[PDB]
Design a protein around this ligand. Structure first.
Ligand SMILES: Nc1ncnc2c1ncn2[C@@H]1O[C@H](COP(=O)(O)OP(=O)(O)O)[C@@H](O)[C@H]1O
Ligand SMILES: Nc1ncnc2c1ncn2[C@@H]1O[C@H](COP(=O)(O)OP(=O)(O)O)[C@@H](O)[C@H]1O
Ligand SMILES: [Zn+2]
Lengths: 92, 193, 638, 195
């Protein structure tokens, strides 16, 4: 029954996260971060919204989505770089 | 349902509800729940389409319940199909060819991915399956469909399912000092799906 | 009673007048002079001449078509006698065709009209049309014209008669397999096949893969409790509105048509303009030519997508499969040489071995989309070599050998090995298949997805706009503005362009191509590449419906060729820059692009074009390596 | 006439067509007289055209590519079987044209060793043993794996065929499209006239 719709209220909060992930993947052996991984943030935000049965994608849903995707990317890097990327993405 | 929906912070209850007997691993349980609920298959303007389901890979050392989680998705989702890496075949997963006992004509029968349509497909020990059976999953992971050309039969079936995969790292133990792209026998294409 | 029907047919043949001429009488007389015992009757004239006989034919043709045959035979014999065998009825019609899936138990013995593609044809069979028989008991003779021999003599025991072979006549018959167009088949369904039969002059007119229009009779025959096999008695085989023509001509007259169509290919994807234009060229396709020795130049344009994963390479093929009027999409893993190409299989309905076309045979005259091309077996690739380069498929199975033509354009998306295409390596080392395949495709595109700040932000903005649903309104407004073409209208335009025009090159375009290819050859790719580039400009001229190919097409064709194949006296200046850099940069040292700019170009020691070309050549010559998008340059060798 | 230059290859083809003279000795020995030619280099470069001319010009030219051994039986509809002739045997007193010679199997190589050396075929099969004359001249074309010939090395490393097989060819020629812009223009103007 539930099909949440999107609004462009938080375009920057997703675009800057995508840019940050791409920048951090430029020179390290890591996930093949591409547009397909950008779509994962949107789809998992939709899934979070669909738990509340809300008809719209809110800022909180996008916050949790960004948290999950960024944590998944970070927790897979090597030890020496992990403790640096812990602080590089302290915003999220 | 609407009584439940109004509770503040419902997301945390849902996340804690996945596989209660498994301790910890909250970062995995959240992904399992998100894949169970899924997203919106936005067929934008018809001429363009996006897959609506979330694909999850469980990679880790032995003794981390990467397998028994699938024994919860199989018992929770409405329609779930479970397969083992070496106990599966490329023909068996996608589609098999049959000759009709009445009309003697070439006919096609759907495989596990066709059966799991509008559901979820589970592949355990995803790393140890042979390369060809792993390759057979490529189209299903993004197109949510099976394209085939055998014995003159040319058709495409709907395979709208999410994939949950569990695997072990190279050597059987994860080397924390080495990147992910070195700890597994898989490749960047497969990881990108 | 039937004498009136015969008289009406006689009038409709002898006395019917159209365009102030006895068109039917004249055409039958011409056929008699040619000695072709067949008459092509147009149903649209028959309905206009007499409606009652048309009603009888439409409702109960079972006795009408024997009447047609005998009346046509008699009238043609009268015409032959006037000027100095049983004549075959051929029906031409333009009425609405019932879909194949809509055929039911209600259209039994009714004449219907169909359209579809031929997938298999049988060998010819000899059937009796006139017999003379003799009784073995008493040598009594008689003639007989489903037919079965008499049980008793007319003068002897049961079944006394035997056939007099030297006083009988026979005719040929062929069995055909028709199926609905796969483009009209929704996903999740195998296209329905249909059995058709033709005889005498209607045999051998089609081969598997041929798209035809049918006029025939729906009927059944016995070969499940009561599953009687349906089959079609073939009666006639045939194989844009004026306002639509004007609309598409105005679309051709659009001064921005090329860019409009370029944007129209997958508007829901960002950038990728070069591959978009290349796919446009593939959709138009080249122009066919025939050598004076009889060989045919393959006009199909085959493009290999050879980039990093997740670069919308699959989405492009899936979009083309929507757009192209004839399109086949299949995965490399789920296909086989026997499935992609033709095969010989036994028909259980007629108990005979049939030559059956494959997926690439079905895509004859169209485009096939294949994915995970690197994952198919080598034998399939060998067959695809023949399909691509000779437009033919060779079959040698059981105890029969045959060659079948296939004019199929192939668009292949392949994943380079090691997952990521390493720029430190030759393309041969980043590939796992036969090297000669690189000599088969006309162009390859090694697309890269190097991380960038602003470009990724713009792409993210586009994707968020798409997920927001604003893209729908934006596309609608662009279509209203004429800047974007609807997918159905685009397909109609492509079909119109394919069917109508066939350009040819001009001397001005050829000379520049020769000069540029000479420069490329001297710098180094074979002579085949120059002839392959001709396909791109022919395709562009087809897009513009121009009578000839033009150099202004050749410019963009050369740009695409350079940005596709080269993905991995000025030459004297370039090599002098190489020498000066070898003196300037010792082995193992590092520098930056901007440093070289400031020290050599701002000092006007060398030009910026010389800088770029020398860096490119030195990187290919393993002398230097470019790192971090030009922020670091390292000399890897001498 | 369709090839510019390559005078030595044409001379070799003419001499091979002319051939030598066979001899017989009081000891029963026989001496080979025929000549073989092998072509090596980049695939599309002029090998196909020369082979086409040789096949079309010679009166007894048989084209071969990777049943040539003539040691296989074809069965009738009633069940009985008969041997089928092979190209190496049918080309007796003729010439054999081979394209994609590198792609031929090892069985073909071990069979053609005797064809090129002793001009005969020794058939040894279950219940069938016979000797057939194979007095045929051989012209073949082969291509490297990389597609581009390494002019600094012999075909023993570019194509890696056995040395015993290569030594049975009396003449060998290597051609590769080393581009000289004016000469390529002169030769390709005829091709352009066909476009
Ligand atoms: N995080 C956990 N919490 C509770 N029990 C666990 C956990 N991880 C593993 N187990 C126990 O260990 C077993 C792991 O089984 P399995 O899923 O095959 O391990 P893996 O797939 O990680 O090799 C399960 O039976 C489960 O009871
Ligand atoms: N330029 C782009 N604009 C919009 N979407 C894009 C773009 N590039 C990639 N994508 C996204 O990537 C997906 C296609 O990935 P695909 O090419 O199928 O992966 P793979 O290369 O592994 O087959 C689509 O869902 C599409 O939304
Ligand atoms: Zn009798």
């Amino acid at each position: 029954k539930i099909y949440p719709k999107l609004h462009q209220m938080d375009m920057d909060k997703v675009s800057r996260v995508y840019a940050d992930l791409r920048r951090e993947s430029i020179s390290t052996g890591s996930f093949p971060i591409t547009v397909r991984h950008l779509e994962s943030i949107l789809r998992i935000a939709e899934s979070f919204a669909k738990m509340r049965l809300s008809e719209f994608v809110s800022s909180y849903d996008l916050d949790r989505a960004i948290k999950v995707v960024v944590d998944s990317f970070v927790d897979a890097q090597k030890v020496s770089v992990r403790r640096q990327l812990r602080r590089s993405f302290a915003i999220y | 349902f609407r009584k439940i929906s109004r509770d503040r912070g419902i997301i945390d209850k849902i996340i804690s509800s996945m596989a209660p007997s498994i301790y910890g691993h909250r970062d995995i349980k959240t992904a399992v729940a998100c894949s169970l609920f899924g997203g919106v298959p936005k067929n934008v303007n018809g001429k363009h389409s996006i897959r609506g389901d979330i694909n999850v890979l469980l990679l880790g050392d032995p003794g981390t319940a990467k397998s028994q989680i699938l024994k919860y998705v199989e018992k929770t989702a409405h329609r779930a199909v479970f397969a083992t890496g070496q106990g599966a075949s490329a023909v068996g997963l996608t589609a098999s060819v049959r000759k009709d006992p009445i009309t003697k004509e070439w006919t096609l029968e759907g495989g596990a991915l066709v059966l799991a349509d509008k559901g979820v497909c589970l592949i355990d020990e995803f790393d140890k399956m042979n390369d060809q059976d792993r390759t057979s999953i490529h189209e299903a992971m993004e197109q949510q469909s099976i394209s085939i050309s055998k014995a003159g039969i040319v058709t495409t079936l709907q395979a709208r399912c999410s994939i949950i995969a569990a695997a072990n790292p190279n050597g059987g133990r994860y080397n924390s000092t080495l990147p992910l792209a070195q700890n597994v026998s898989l490749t960047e294409p497969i990881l990108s799906r | 009673d039937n004498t009136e029907i015969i008289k009406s047919f006689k009038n409709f043949i002898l006395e019917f007048r159209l365009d102030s001429q006895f068109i039917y009488r004249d055409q039958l007389r011409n056929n008699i002079l040619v000695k072709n015992y067949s008459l092509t009757v147009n149903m649209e004239h028959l309905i206009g001449y007499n409606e009652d006989i048309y009603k009888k034919l439409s409702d109960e043709p079972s006795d009408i078509i024997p009447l047609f045959e005998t009346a046509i035979t008699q009238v043609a014999k009268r015409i032959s006698i006037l000027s100095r065998p049983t004549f075959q009825l051929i029906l031409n019609s333009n009425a609405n065709q019932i879909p194949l899936r809509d055929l039911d138990s209600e259209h039994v013995s009714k004449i219907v009209r169909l359209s579809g593609i031929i997938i298999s044809t049988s060998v010819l069979s000899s059937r009796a049309t006139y017999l003379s028989i003799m009784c073995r008991n008493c040598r009594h003779t008689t003639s007989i014209t489903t037919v079965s021999l008499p049980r008793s003599c007319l003068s002897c025991g049961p079944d006394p008669y035997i056939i007099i072979h030297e006083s009988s006549k026979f005719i040929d018959q062929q069995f055909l397999k028709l199926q609905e167009i796969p483009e009209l088949v929704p996903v999740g369904e195998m296209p329905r096949n249909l059995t058709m039969t033709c005889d005498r002059y209607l045999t051998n007119k089609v081969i598997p893969g041929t798209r035809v229009t049918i006029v025939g009779i729906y009927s059944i025959y016995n070969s499940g409790v009561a599953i009687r096999t349906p089959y079609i008695k073939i009666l006639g085989i045939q194989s844009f509105t004026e306002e639509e023509e004007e609309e598409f001509l105005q679309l051709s007259r659009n001064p921005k048509l090329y860019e409009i169509l370029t944007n129209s290919i997958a508007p829901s994807i960002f950038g990728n303009e070069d591959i978009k234009k290349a796919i446009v060229c593939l959709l138009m396709g080249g122009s066919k030519k025939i050598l004076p020795d009889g060989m045919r130049l393959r006009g199909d344009i085959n493009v290999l997508l050879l980039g990093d994963p997740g670069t919308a390479k699959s989405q492009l093929l899936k979009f083309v499969e929507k757009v192209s009027p004839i399109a086949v999409y299949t995965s490399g893993k789920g296909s086989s040489a026997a499935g992609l190409t033709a095969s010989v299989q036994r028909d259980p309905m007629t108990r005979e071995f049939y030559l059956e076309g494959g997926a690439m045979v079905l895509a004859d005259g169209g485009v096939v989309c294949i994915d995970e091309f690197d994952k198919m077996r080598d034998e399939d690739r060998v067959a695809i070599h023949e399909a691509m380069e000779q437009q033919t498929i060779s079959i040698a199975k059981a105890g029969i050998t045959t060659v079948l033509n296939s004019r199929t354009s192939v668009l292949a998306a392949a994943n380079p090995i090691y997952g990521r295409y390493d720029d430190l390596k030759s393309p041969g080392d980043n590939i796992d298949f036969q090297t000669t395949i690189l000599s088969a495709f006309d162009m390859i595109f090694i697309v890269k997805d190097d991380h960038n700040e602003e470009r990724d932000i713009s792409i993210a903005n586009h994707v968020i706009n798409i997920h927001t649903g604003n893209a729908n309104a934006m596309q609608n407004q662009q279509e209203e503005n004429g800047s974007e073409i609807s997918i159905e209208k685009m397909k109609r335009y492509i079909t119109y362009c394919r069917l109508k025009c066939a350009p040819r090159l001009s001397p001005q375009a050829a000379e520049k191509l020769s000069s540029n290819f000479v420069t490329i050859r001297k710098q180094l790719i074979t002579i085949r590449q120059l002839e392959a580039i001709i396909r791109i400009t022919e395709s562009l001229a087809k897009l513009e419906l121009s009578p000839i190919a033009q150099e202004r097409h050749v410019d963009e064709a050369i740009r695409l060729f350079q940005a596709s194949t080269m993905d991995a006296t000025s030459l004297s200046e370039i090599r002098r820059f190489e020498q000066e850099l070898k003196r300037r940069l010792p082995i193992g040292w590092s520098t930056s692009y901007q440093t070289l700019r400031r020290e050599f170009v701002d000092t006007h020691r060398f030009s910026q074009l010389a800088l770029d070309k020398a860096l490119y050549a030195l990187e290919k010559h393993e002398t230097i390596q470019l790192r971090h998008q030009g922020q670091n340059i390292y000399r890897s060798g001498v | 006439p369709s090839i510019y230059g390559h005078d030595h290859i044409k001379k070799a083809i003419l001499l091979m067509l002319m051939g030598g003279v066979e001899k017989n000795l009081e000891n029963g020995s026989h001496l080979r007289g025929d000549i073989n030619i092998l072509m090596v280099g980049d695939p599309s470069t002029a090998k196909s055209q020369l082979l086409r001319f040789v096949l079309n010009t010679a009166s007894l030219a048989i084209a071969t590519t990777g049943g040539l051994t003539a040691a296989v039986t074809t069965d009738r509809e009633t069940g009985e079987r008969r041997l089928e002739a092979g190209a190496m045997v049918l080309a007796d007193r003729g010439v054999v044209c081979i394209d994609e010679f590198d792609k031929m199997t090892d069985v073909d190589r071990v069979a053609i060793h005797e064809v090129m050396e002793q001009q005969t075929v020794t058939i040894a099969k279950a219940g069938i043993h016979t000797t057939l004359n194979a007095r045929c001249s051989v012209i073949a074309a082969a291509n490297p794996v990389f597609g581009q010939y390494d002019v600094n090395r012999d075909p023993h490393q570019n194509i890696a065929l056995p040395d015993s097989l290569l030594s049975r060819f009396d003449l060998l020629f290597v051609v590769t499209d080393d581009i000289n812009e004016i000469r390529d223009r002169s030769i390709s103007e005829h091709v352009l006239r066909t476009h």
